[PDB]
Design a protein around this ligand. Structure first.
Ligand code: CLA
Ligand code: CLA
Ligand code: CLA
Ligand code: CLA
Ligand code: CLA
Ligand code: CLA
Ligand code: CLA
Ligand code: CLA
Ligand SMILES: CCCCCCCCCCCCCCCC(=O)OC[C@H](COP(=O)(O)OC[C@@H](O)CO)OC(=O)CCCCCCCCCCCCCCC
Ligand SMILES: CC1=C(/C=C/C(C)=C/C=C/C(C)=C/C=C/C=C(C)/C=C/C=C(C)/C=C/C2=C(C)CCCC2(C)C)C(C)(C)CCC1
Ligand code: SF4
Ligand code: SF4
Ligand code: SF4
Lengths: 732, 160, 80, 142, 63, 82, 30, 87
C-alpha cells in the first residue's frame, strides 16, 4: 500500500504517474477504494473545517502583516496621499536600487503596497490602530484553532455525525438562513451601529466601553416602542468628514442612498439598515422548512407538488429532492452557480457603489478588486458546470428522475446545445464583423463610416434609474412617474446626486463601444455556456460514444477509431471552456480597466472614439497603458513597477509554456523520455543512480490540465501585472 | 434621442468633414493638378463630400465624437438604420436558407444523394433559386402544413 | 490492468484479434452469430489499452470495449 | 496442447547491435524471447530498430516488450510464411510461454479455450454509475 | 424470423448511430440462438465508415 | 512593373522615390492605400526588390518589362504544353 | 505600533494552531 | 544468446566498468576517514542534524550580516520616490 493509499489501483503503478495522480485524485473522495457514505461525508465535513481554518489563518496573516509591517495608522491619518502597505519585503536578491525603490509609504525598508482593499475595508468597519488589527489577528487565530479542534472532533467516533444528519436539508436550510445569513447580518448590524458608525463619527467604541457608549441618544427605547424613525432622525450631513465628530449626525439607521460626499462611498448608516433588513428577512425566511416542531415545509412534497398539469414539464420536479440530497455534486454545482452569480454581483456592485471609505479614490485597488471577483467567479461558475457534468456521470439516476425537468433536459439537450451554438455564432459574426468593419473604416481614413450602435436599451434602463443625460424621461428621470414620487422623499435625493455625477463609476455613460463589448461579453458567456452545457448534457453519452458514463468523468479519449475521439469527455469540455472563461473575463476586465482608465484621468472621449475598433484596444489600451509597465526596469535603471514588469514577462513565460502541453502531445515526449531513460541507464557514473518511479511522459488528461493551469497562471499574472502597473504607476 | 444631436447640426460631424478634405488637400499639394494620381484624390474628395452630405440628410444621430450612431430600437425616425435593411437582409438570408433547404430535399430523393452536393445540379439549383423569391409565403406555408419541421420520432437523437 | 469486455453484439469478424498488438484477444466458440464465434480477453493484463480492436470493430456500437483502469508496467508499454 | 520448451541452444540472428534493445527492465522485471523456425538466411527489420540477418535454422531473439514480439511476429507471418512463438522470461529463471496458448493462433477459433470477459448484454444495457455507487463492481464487470 | 427481407425498418437501439433512422433489411438469420439476426443496411455510414449492422427484432419496428 | 509601377520614375532617382508596383482600385476607401511613393505616382510600396533587380538587369524602359512579361507568358504556355 | 512581546504571543498561538492543523491532518489520514 | 544456466549474463546484468581490486589505499589513510566520518553514517541520524544544523546556519548569517554584506540589511540610503497623485 504505497502512496496514494486511497486508491489501490494507483499504488501498483510503477511510474511517475502514481506520484502525479495521487496529488490530483486526493480530494476526489468518492472515487477512492473501500470507500463508504459515512467516510465520504465526514471527510468532506473535516475538509470544510480545514478550509475554514485556512481562510481564517489567511485573514490572520493579512491582518498581522498590516498591523506589523504596514502603516495602517499613517493611512488612517491621510487615506488620499499614503499608499497602503501590505507587508515588508526581505529578499536576499535585491541590490541597493531595489531596496531604495521599493521603500514606499514612509516605511523603514522595502515594502509591498497593498492593492487588496483591506485598509479601506478595515477603516470603514472601525479598525483604527495597529493594536486593533493585532487583536483581530489573534482572535482569528483562535477562531481557526477552534475550527481545527472541531474538524478533529467530528472525525472522532464519539462525535461522528451520520449521513442522515448530513442529508437533513430542511434543518440545514433553517439554521443557515436563520443563523448563518440572519444572526450574522444582525451581528454585523450590531457592529456597524455600535462600532463603525461612532468610529466614523469620531467616538472610540471598543470592548472596554461597549456597555457604556450608547449608539443613539435614546437607545432601545424607540426600538421597542415602535417609533423606529428616531433611528433615522439626524443623519450625517454633506459637510461630514469621515472619522471626525464635526459635521456628523446621531441617526444609526438611515435610508439616504447614494454616496458619502467626501469618500465617494456608501453610508455606514445605510449599510447598517441594509443589514438589519437582510437580517430580519433572513431570520424570517429561516423559519420556512420543517425540522422538529410540526410546522414548516417538506421540500420533497414542494418539489412533488410543483408539476404543471398540462404536461409541458413532464413530471415537473418529482424525484428531484432525493436527486439533490443524494448527489453531493448537484449541491456543489448549485452552490457554485449561486456563488459565481454573486461573486460577479460582488464585482459589479463594489465599483459602481463603493462600500468602503476612500476605496473609490484608490484606482488600482478598485481595478484589482473587480478583476479578482470576475476571475474567481469565472472559475466558480465553470466549476458549477463541471460539477453538473460530474453529477450526470456519477450521480444522475435516470430511473429516479423519470420524465422530470432534469430528465427532460437530457430529452431536448441537442436543442439547447444547438441554440446556444446559434446564439454564440450570431454574437461572434456580428461582434467580429462590426469590430473588423470599424477597424477597416479607421484604417481607410473614414471614422464616420463605422456602424456605431447606441445601446439604447441599457441607456433606457439608466434613464429609468435616473440618468438625465440621454433625455428619455420615462420614470425616475421624469417627475410625472409614480415611482419617482414614491421615491423622491425617501432614497432618491442621495441616488440622483450619486448617479448624475460624472466622476464616479455609478452607471457610467455608455456608447457604441460599450454596445460592441457587451456583445463580446454575451459572446463570451454564450460560448462558455455552450461548451459547458454541451459537456454537462453529453456527459453520459452521445452519438459518437454512448457509454461516456461508464468511462468516468475525466477520461482522456476513446481511441483514433470512429473518426477520432479526442477531447470527447466532459472534463475536456470544461478544459476547453476554461479558455473561454479566460477570454470572457479578459474581455470584461479589458472593458472595465479601459472604461475606468479613461474615466479616472478625465478623457472619456478616448474610450468613446477608440473602443469601437480593435486597433484602439491594441494601441490606446494594450500599448498605451503598457508604457510604464515594461519600463519598470531598463538598462538605465529600475523603478518601483519592476516587480510588475517581471511578473508581466513571467506571465508570458508560463502561458506560453502551457502551449507546450496544449499543442505537443504525449507520445513524442514518451519516446523522448524513452531515449532519456536509455541515456541514464548507459551513462557511466550516472547509471549507479536508479529511479524507483519509471520516467514516463505526462498523461493525456494531466497534459491538458498542466497546459490549462499554466495558461491560467500566465493569463492571471500577465493581467495582474499589467493592470496593477498601468494604474498604479500612472494614478488616474 | 439618447442624448445624440442630429448629424446635420452637429459641430463635431462638420469638424470631421473639414479635417478629412484638409488631409486629402495636403496630399494633393505634391502632385500636378492635371496628373493621373491627382484625379484619384479629387475623386476621393468628391466621394467624401457626397458621403457627409448623405449622412446628414438621412436624419442620422451624431454623438460627442462627431460620429453617426445607429438607433436599433425600432424608432419611427430611424427605420433605415436597422429595421429597413434588416428586413432587406432577412429576405435575402432567408432566400439563401430556403434554396439550400429545398435543394437538399430535391437531392435526397435521388439515386446518389452525395454526388449532388459535391457536384451541384445547376438546372436543379437554378430552378429553385428563382423559387426562393417568395419564401416567407413558402416557409410559413410549410410551417402551417407541417412540412417545415420533422417529428422527433424520425430524428437521430443521441442517448441519455 | 485494463479491462477489455466483449458484448453479445459481436459477429465474429475476427479483426479485433488481428488488430491486437499484445495478443490479448482470442476467438472462442459461441452460438450467437453466423460465424459461431465471439472474442474474449483472457490476457487482459497484457493490454496496453491502445483500442486498435475498437477501431477495427465494425459493429455499431462496439462489441469489444476497452476500459482504461489501473495501469501497470504492462499497460504503460515501457522497456526500462 | 503441450507448450514448447525453450531450448537455450539455438543461436541468434546476425545483428550488429542496437541501442533499442534490453534495458534494466530485462534485468529486474521481465524480458521476452521469441523463437521461430526459418527456411533460409533472410534479412528482417528489427522491432528495436535496424536490420539483422536471420539464420537458416531456428532463431532466438530477445525483446523487452510483448508488443515487440507481435510487431515482429506479424511481420514474419505476412511477409514470410513462418510460424512463430514467444515466451516471457523472468529474472529468477522462469520461462512463461505466452503465444499461441493453444498452439493455434488466436485469430482462428479453438474448442479448448473458454469465454472470459464476455458480457451477454450490449453496451446500451450496461447499468448507470449512479446505482453502483461505493462498490467494487463497476458498470461493465457484472 | 424477422419482419421481412427488403423491408424498411426503424432502429430502436439507443447506442446505435442509426437510432430513429430508416434502414433496409438485407438478411435475417433463421438459425436459433442468434441474438441479433436482422442485418440492416443504411444509406449513410457511421463514424467507422460502415453501414452494415446486426439488430434484434425487438430493436426494430416496421416504418 | 510595366503598367502599374513607377519604375522609370524610380530609375530617374531612387534615393527619394519608394519602389511601388501595385495600384489598388478606388472602391471602398482602399484608395488611401495608394500612397505618395514619389515620382507623381500612387500605389502600394513594394518590398520584393524587383526594382533593384531590374536596375541590376539593365532594364531602362517599361516596354522591356512588358516584353519580359509576355515572354514569360509564352514560357508559361510552354510549361503547360510540356 | 505593536510591541516585541506581542509577536511572541502571535508566534506561539500560530504554533498551537499549527499543532491543531497537524492533528487534523493525522485524523484526515486515518 | 539465451543460456538457462546463467540468467544474469543473458539479460544485461554486467558490471561494465567495475573492478575487483580489494584495496589500493594504506591503513593510515583509511583509519583517519572512518574515525572522522563515524558520526555521519546513519541516514536517520544524518538527516536530523543536517535539517536542524542547516536551519540554524542560514538564520545566523541571515541576521549577523551587515550593510555591505547584503543589501536587504543595508536599508534605504536615499530619499524615497514619491508616486503619482501625491501618493
Ligand atoms: C467549493 C468548490 C469546489 C469543491 C471542493 C470541488 C470538489 C471537487 N472537484 Mg472541483 N471545481 C471547482 C470547485 C470545487 N471543486 C472549481 C472552482 C473548478 C474550476 C477550476 C472545478 C473543476 C474541477 C474538475 C472539472 C474536476 C474537479 C473535481 C473535483 C474533486 C477534487 C479533485 C482534486 O483533488 O483536485 C486536485 C487538483 C489539483 C491538485 C490541481 C490544482 C493545481 C492548481 C490549479 C495550480 C472534488 C469532487 C474532479 C472530479 O470530481 O473528478 C471526477 C474533476 O475532474 N473539479
Ligand atoms: C444556526 C446554526 C448554524 C450555523 C451558524 C451554521 C454555520 C455553518 N455551517 Mg452548519 N448546520 C447547522 C447549524 C448551523 N450551521 C445545522 C443544524 C445543520 C444540520 C443539518 C448543519 C449542517 C452543516 C453541514 C453538513 C455543513 C455546515 C457548514 C457550515 C458552515 C458554512 C460554510 C461557511 O463557513 O461559509 C460561511 C458562509 C457564510 C458566512 C454565509 C455568507 C453568504 C454569502 C456567500 C456571502 C455574503 C456575505 C458578505 C457579502 C461578504 C462580506 C464579507 C467580506 C467583507 C469579507 C458554517 C460555519 C459546512 C462547513 O463548512 O462545515 C465546517 C458543512 O459541511 N453545516
Ligand atoms: C446580534 C446583534 C447585537 C448584539 C449582540 C447587541 C448587543 C448590545 N446592544 Mg445592540 N444593536 C444591534 C444589535 C446588536 N446589539 C442592532 C440590530 C441595533 C440597531 C437597532 C443596535 C442598536 C442598539 C442600541 C441603540 C443600543 C444597543 C445596546 C445594546 C447592549 C445591551 C442590549 C440590551 O440591554 O438588551 C449590547 C451591548 C444598548 C446599550 O446600552 O448599548 C450601550 C442600546 O441602547 N443596541
Ligand atoms: C450587412 C452585413 C451582414 C452580413 C455580412 C452578416 C453575416 C451573417 N449573418 Mg447577419 N445580420 C445583419 C447583416 C449582416 N450579417 C443584419 C442587418 C441583421 C438584422 C436583421 C442580422 C441578423 C442576423 C440573423 C438573424 C442571422 C444572421 C446570420 C448571418 C450569418 C449566416 C447567414 C446565412 O448564410 O444564412 C443561413 C441561413 C439561414 C436561414 C439563416 C438566416 C436567418 C433566418 C432568415 C431567420 C452570416 C455570417 C445568422 C447568424 O449570424 O447567426 C448564426 C442568423 O441567424 N444575421
Ligand atoms: C480569434 C480567435 C477565435 C475565433 C474567432 C474562434 C472561433 C469560434 N469559436 Mg473559439 N476558441 C478559440 C479561439 C477563437 N474562437 C480558442 C483559443 C479556443 C480554446 C481551445 C477556442 C475553442 C472553441 C470551442 C471549445 C468552442 C468555440 C466555438 C467557436 C465559434 C464561436 C461562435 C462564434 O463566434 O461564431 C462566429 C465565428 C467567428 C467569429 C469566426 C469568423 C471567421 C470568419 C467567418 C472567416 C471569414 C467560432 C467558430 C464554439 C463553436 O464553434 O460553437 C458554435 C465552441 O463550442 N471555440
Ligand atoms: C442573441 C443575440 C443577442 C444577445 C445575447 C444580446 C446581448 C446583449 N444586448 Mg442586444 N441586441 C441584439 C442581439 C443580442 N443582444 C440585436 C440583434 C440588436 C440590434 C442590433 C440588439 C440591440 C441592443 C441594444 C440597443 C443594447 C443591447 C444590449 C444588450 C444586453 C441586454 C439584452 C438586450 O437588450 O437584448 C435585446 C435583444 C434583442 C432585441 C434581440 C434578441 C436576439 C434576436 C432574436 C436576434 C446584452 C449584453 C445593451 C447593451 O449593449 O448594454 C450596454 C443595449 O442597450 N442590445
Ligand atoms: C443549406 C442551407 C442551410 C440552412 C437552411 C441552414 C440553417 C440552419 N443552420 Mg446551418 N450551415 C449550413 C447551411 C445551412 N444552414 C452549412 C453549409 C454549414 C457549414 C458552414 C452550416 C453550419 C451550421 C452551424 C455551425 C450552425 C448551423 C445552424 C443553423 C440554424 C440557424 C442558422 C445559423 O446558425 O446561421 C447559419 C450558420 C452558418 C455557420 C452559416 C452557414 C450557411 C451557409 C453560408 C449557407 C450555404 C448554403 C448553400 C446552398 C451552400 C439553422 C437550422 C446552427 C444550429 O445548430 O441550429 C440552431 C449552428 O450552430 N449551421
Ligand atoms: C483546503 C486545503 C486542503 C484540505 C482540507 C485537504 C484535505 C486532505 N488532504 Mg490534501 N492537499 C491540498 C490541500 C488540502 N488538503 C493541497 C495543497 C494539495 C496539493 C495540491 C493536497 C494534496 C494531498 C495529497 C497528495 C493527499 C491529501 C490528503 C488529504 C488529507 C490530509 C492528509 C494530509 O495531507 O496530511 C496533512 C499533513 C500535513 C499538513 C503536514 C485530507 C483529506 C491525503 C489523503 O489521503 O487524501 C484523502 C493524500 O494522500 N492531500
Ligand atoms: C394572453 C394570455 C396568455 C396566456 C397564455 C399562456 C398559456 O398558453 O399557458 C400555457 C402554460 C400553462 O401551462 P401549465 O401546464 O402550467 O398549465 C396547464 C394549462 O392548461 C392551465 O390549466 O403557461 C405558460 O407556458 C406560461 C406562460 C407565461 C409565462 C410567465 C413567465 C413568468 C416569468 C417569471 C415571472
Ligand atoms: C448542468 C447542471 C447543473 C448546473 C447548471 C448551472 C451551473 C446553471 C447555471 C445557471 C445560472 C447561473 C443561472 C442564473 C440565473 C439567474 C437569473 C435567471 C437571474 C434573474 C434575475 C431576475 C429575473 C431578477 C429580477 C429583477 C431585475 C432583472 C431587475 C430589477 C430587479 C428585479 C429583482 C425585479 C446542476 C449543478 C444543477 C446539476 C445538474 C446539471
Ligand atoms: S491518444 Fe491523443 S491522438 Fe490518440 S485518440 Fe486519444 S486524444 Fe486522440
Ligand atoms: S486495447 Fe489494444 S492491446 Fe488491448 S485488446 Fe484492444 S487492441 Fe488488444
Ligand atoms: S472486431 Fe468486434 S465484431 Fe469483430 S470479432 Fe472482434 S468484437 Fe466481434
Amino acid at each position: 500500500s504505497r502512496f496514494p493509499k486511497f486508491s489501490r489501483g494507483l499504488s501498483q503503478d510503477p511510474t511517475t504517474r502514481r506520484i502525479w495522480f495521487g496529488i490530483a485524485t486526493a480530494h476526489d473522495f468518492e472515487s477512492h477504494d473501500d470507500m463508504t457514505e459515512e467516510r465520504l461525508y465526514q471527510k468532506i465535513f473535516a475538509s470544510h473545517f480545514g478550509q475554514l481554518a485556512i481562510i481564517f489563518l489567511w485573514t490572520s496573516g493579512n491582518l498581522f502583516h498590516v498591523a506589523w509591517q504596514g502603516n495602517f495608522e499613517a493611512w488612517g491619518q491621510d487615506p488620499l496621499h499614503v499608499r497602503p502597505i501590505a507587508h515588508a519585503i526581505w529578499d536576499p536578491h535585491f541590490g541597493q536600487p531595489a531596496v531604495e525603490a521599493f521603500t514606499r509609504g514612509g516605511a523603514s525598508g522595502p515594502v509591498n503596497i497593498a492593492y487588496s482593499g483591506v485598509y479601506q475595508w478595515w477603516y470603514t468597519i472601525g479598525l483604527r490602530t495597529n493594536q486593533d488589527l493585532y487583536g483581530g489577528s489573534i482572535f482569528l487565530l483562535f477562531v481557526s484553532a477552534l475550527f481545527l479542534i472541531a474538524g478533529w472532533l467530528h472525525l472522532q467516533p464519539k462525535w461522528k455525525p451520520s449521513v442522515s444528519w448530513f442529508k437533513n436539508a430542511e434543518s440545514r436550510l433553517n439554521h443557515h438562513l436563520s443563523g448563518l445569513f440572519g444572526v450574522s447580518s444582525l451581528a454585523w448590524t450590531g457592529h456597524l451601529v455600535h462600532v463603525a458608525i461612532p468610529e466614523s463619527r469620531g467616538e472610540h467604541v471598543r470592548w472596554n466601553n461597549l456597555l457604556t457608549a450608547l449608539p443613539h441618544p435614546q437607545g432601545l427605547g424607540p426600538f421597542f416602542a415602535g417609533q423606529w424613525n428616531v433611528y433615522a432622525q439626524n443623519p450625517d450631513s454633506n459637510s461630514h468628514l469621515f472619522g471626525t465628530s464635526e459635521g456628523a449626525g446621531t441617526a444609526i439607521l438611515t435610508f439616504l442612498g447614494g454616496f458619502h460626499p467626501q469618500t465617494q462611498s456608501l453610508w455606514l448608516t445605510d449599510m447598517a439598515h441594509h443589514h438589519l433588513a437582510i437580517a430580519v428577512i433572513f431570520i424570517i425566511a429561516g423559519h420556512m422548512y420543517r425540522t422538529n416542531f410540526g410546522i414548516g415545509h417538506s421540500m420533497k412534497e414542494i418539489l412533488e407538488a410543483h408539476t404543471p398539469p398540462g404536461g409541458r414539464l413532464g413530471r415537473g420536479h418529482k424525484g428531484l429532492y432525493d436527486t439533490i440530497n443524494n448527489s453531493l455534486h448537484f449541491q456543489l454545482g448549485l452552490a457554485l452557480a449561486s456563488l459565481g452569480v454573486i461573486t460577479s454581483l460582488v464585482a459589479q456592485h463594489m465599483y459602481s457603489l463603493p462600500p468602503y471609505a476612500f476605496l473609490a479614490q484608490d484606482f488600482t485597488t478598485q481595478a484589482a478588486l473587480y478583476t479578482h471577483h470576475q476571475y474567481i467567479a469565472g472559475f466558480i461558475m465553470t466549476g458549477a458546470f463541471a460539477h453538473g457534468a460530474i453529477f450526470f456521470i456519477r450521480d444522475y439516476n435516470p430511473e429516479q428522475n423519470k420524465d422530470n425537468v432534469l430528465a427532460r433536459m437530457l430529452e431536448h439537450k441537442e436543442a439547447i446545445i444547438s441554440h446556444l451554438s446559434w446564439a454564440s455564432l450570431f454574437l461572434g459574426f456580428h461582434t467580429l464583423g462590426l469590430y473588423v468593419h470599424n477597424d477597416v473604416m479607421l484604417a481607410f481614413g473614414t471614422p464616420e463610416k463605422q456602424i456605431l450602435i447606441e445601446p439604447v436599451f441599457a441607456q433606457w434602463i439608466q434613464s429609468a434609474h435616473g440618468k438625465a443625460l440621454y433625455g428619455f424621461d420615462v420614470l425616475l428621470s421624469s417627475a410625472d412617474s409614480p415611482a419617482f414620487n414614491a421615491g423622491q422623499t425617501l432614497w432618491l435625493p442621495g441616488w440622483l446626486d450619486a448617479i448624475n455625477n460624472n466622476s464616479n463609476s455609478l452607471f457610467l455613460t455608455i456608447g457604441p463601444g460599450d454596445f460592441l463589448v457587451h456583445h463580446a461579453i454575451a459572446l463570451g458567456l454564450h460560448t462558455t455556456t455552450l461548451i459547458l452545457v454541451k459537456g454537462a448534457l453529453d456527459a453520459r453519452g452521445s452519438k459518437l460514444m454512448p457509454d461516456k458514463k461508464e468511462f468516468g468523468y475525466s477520461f482522456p479519449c476513446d481511441g483514433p477509431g470512429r473518426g477520432g475521439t479526442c477531447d470527447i469527455s466532459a472534463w475536456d469540455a470544461f478544459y476547453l471552456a476554461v479558455f473561454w472563461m479566460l477570454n470572457t473575463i479578459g474581455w470584461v476586465t479589458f472593458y472595465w480597466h479601459w472604461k475606468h482608465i479613461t474615466l479616472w484621468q478625465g478623457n472619456v472621449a478616448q474610450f468613446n472614439e477608440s473602443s469601437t475598433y480593435l486597433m484602439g484596444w491594441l494601441r490606446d489600451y494594450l500599448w498605451l497603458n503598457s508604457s510604464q509597465l515594461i519600463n519598470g526596469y531598463n538598462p538605465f535603471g529600475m523603478n518601483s513597477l519592476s516587480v510588475w514588469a517581471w511578473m508581466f514577462l513571467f506571465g508570458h513565460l508560463v502561458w506560453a509554456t502551457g502551449f507546450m502541453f496544449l499543442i505537443s502531445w504525449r507520445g513524442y515526449w514518451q519516446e523522448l523520455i524513452e531515449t532519456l531513460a536509455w541515456a541514464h541507464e548507459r551513462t557511466p557514473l550516472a547509471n549507479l543512480v536508479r529511479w524507483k518511479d519509471k520516467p514516463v511522459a505526462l498523461s493525456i488528461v494531466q497534459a491538458r490540465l498542466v497546459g490549462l493551469a499554466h495558461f491560467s497562471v500566465g493569463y492571471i499574472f500577465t493581467y495582474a501585472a499589467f493592470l496593477i502597473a498601468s494604474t498604479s504607476g500612472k494614478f488616474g | 434621442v439618447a442624448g445624440l444631436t442630429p448629424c446635420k447640426e452637429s459641430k463635431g460631424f462638420a469638424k470631421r468633414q473639414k479635417q478629412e478634405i484638409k488631409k486629402l488637400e495636403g496630399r494633393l499639394k505634391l502632385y500636378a493638378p492635371d496628373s493621373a494620381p491627382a484625379l484619384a484624390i479629387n475623386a476621393t474628395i468628391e466621394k467624401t463630400k457626397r458621403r457627409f452630405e448623405f449622412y446628414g440628410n438621412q436624419g442620422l444621430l451624431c454623438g460627442t465624437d462627431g460620429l453617426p450612431h445607429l438607433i436599433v430600437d425600432g424608432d419611427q425616425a430611424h427605420l433605415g438604420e436597422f429595421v429597413y435593411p434588416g428586413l432587406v437582409f432577412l429576405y435575402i438570408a432567408g432566400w439563401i436558407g430556403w434554396v439550400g433547404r429545398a435543394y437538399l430535399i430535391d437531392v435526397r430523393t435521388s439515386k446518389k444523394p452525395t454526388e449532388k452536393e459535391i457536384i451541384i445540379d445547376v438546372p436543379l439549383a437554378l430552378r429553385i433559386m428563382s423559387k426562393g423569391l417568395t419564401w416567407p409565403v413558402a416557409a410559413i406555408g410549410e410551417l402551417r402544413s407541417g412540412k417545415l419541421v420533422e417529428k422527433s420520432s424520425n430524428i437521430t437523437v443521441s442517448p441519455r | 490492468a485494463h479491462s477489455v469486455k466483449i458484448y453479445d453484439t459481436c459477429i465474429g469478424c475476427t479483426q479485433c484479434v488481428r488488430a491486437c498488438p499484445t495478443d490479448v484477444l482470442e476467438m472462442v466458440p459461441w452460438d450467437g452469430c453466423k460465424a459461431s464465434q465471439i472474442a474474449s480477453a483472457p490476457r487482459t493484463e497484457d493490454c496496453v489499452g491502445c483500442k486498435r480492436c475498437e477501431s477495427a470493430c465494425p459493429t455499431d456500437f462496439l462489441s469489444v470495449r476497452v476500459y482504461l483502469g489501473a495501469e501497470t508496467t504492462r499497460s504503460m508499454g515501457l522497456a526500462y | 496442447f503441450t507448450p514448447p520448451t525453450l531450448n537455450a541452444d539455438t543461436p541468434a540472428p546476425i545483428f550488429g547491435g542496437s541501442t533499442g534493445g534490453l534495458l534494466r527492465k530485462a534485468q529486474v522485471e521481465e524480458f521476452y524471447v521469441i523463437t521461430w523456425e526459418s527456411p533460409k538466411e533472410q534479412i528482417f527489420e528489427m522491432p528495436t530498430g535496424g536490420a539483422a540477418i536471420m539464420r537458416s535454422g531456428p532463431n532466438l531473439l530477445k525483446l523487452a516488450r510483448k508488443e515487440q514480439c507481435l510487431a515482429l511476429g506479424a511481420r514474419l507471418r505476412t511477409k514470410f510464411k513462418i510460424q512463430y512463438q514467444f515466451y516471457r522470461v523472468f529474472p529468477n529463471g522462469e520461462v512463461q510461454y505466452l503465444h499461441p496458448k493453444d498452439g493455434v493462433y488466436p485469430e482462428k477459433v479453438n474448442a479448448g479455450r473458454t469465454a472470459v470477459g464476455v458480457n451477454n448484454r450490449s453496451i446500451g444495457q450496461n447499468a448507470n454509475p449512479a446505482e453502483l455507487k461505493f462498490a467494487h463492481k463497476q458498470a461493465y464487470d457484472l | 424470423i424477422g419482419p421481412k427481407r427488403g423491408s424498411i425498418v426503424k432502429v430502436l437501439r439507443r447506442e446505435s448511430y442509426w437510432f430513429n433512422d430508416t434502414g433496409k433489411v438485407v438478411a435475417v438469420d433463421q438459425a436459433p440462438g442468434v441474438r441479433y439476426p436482422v442485418v440492416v443496411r443504411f444509406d449513410k455510414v457511421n463514424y467507422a465508415g460502415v453501414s452494415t449492422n446486426n439488430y434484434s427484432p425487438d430493436e426494430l419496428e416496421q416504418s | 512593373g510595366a503598367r502599374f509601377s513607377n519604375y522609370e520614375a524610380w530609375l530617374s532617382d531612387p534615393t527619394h522615390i519608394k519602389p511601388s508596383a501595385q495600384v489598388v482600385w478606388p472602391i471602398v476607401g482602399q484608395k488611401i492605400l495608394n500612397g505618395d511613393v514619389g515620382g507623381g505616382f500612387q500605389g502600394i510600396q513594394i518590398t520584393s526588390g524587383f526594382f533593384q533587380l531590374w536596375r541590376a538587369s539593365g532594364i531602362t524602359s517599361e516596354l522591356q518589362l512588358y516584353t519580359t512579361a509576355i515572354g514569360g507568358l509564352i514560357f508559361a504556355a510552354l510549361m503547360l504544353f510540356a | 505600533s505593536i510591541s516585541d512581546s506581542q509577536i511572541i504571543v502571535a508566534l506561539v498561538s500560530a504554533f498551537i494552531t499549527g499543532i491543531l492543523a497537524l492533528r487534523l491532518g493525522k485524523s484526515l489520514y486515518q | 544468446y539465451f543460456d538457462l544456466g546463467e540468467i544474469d549474463n543473458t539479460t544485461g546484468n554486467w558490471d561494465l566498468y567495475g573492478n575487483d581490486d580489494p584495496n589500493r589505499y594504506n591503513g593510515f589513510q583509511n583509519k583517519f576517514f572512518e574515525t572522522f566520518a563515524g558520526a555521519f553514517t546513519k541516514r536517520g541520524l544524518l538527516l536530523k542534524f543536517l535539517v536542524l544544523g542547516g536551519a540554524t546556519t542560514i538564520g545566523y548569517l541571515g541576521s549577523t550580516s551587515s550593510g555591505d554584506l547584503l543589501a536587504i540589511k543595508n536599508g534605504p540610503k536615499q530619499a524615497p520616490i514619491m508616486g503619482p497623485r501625491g501618493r
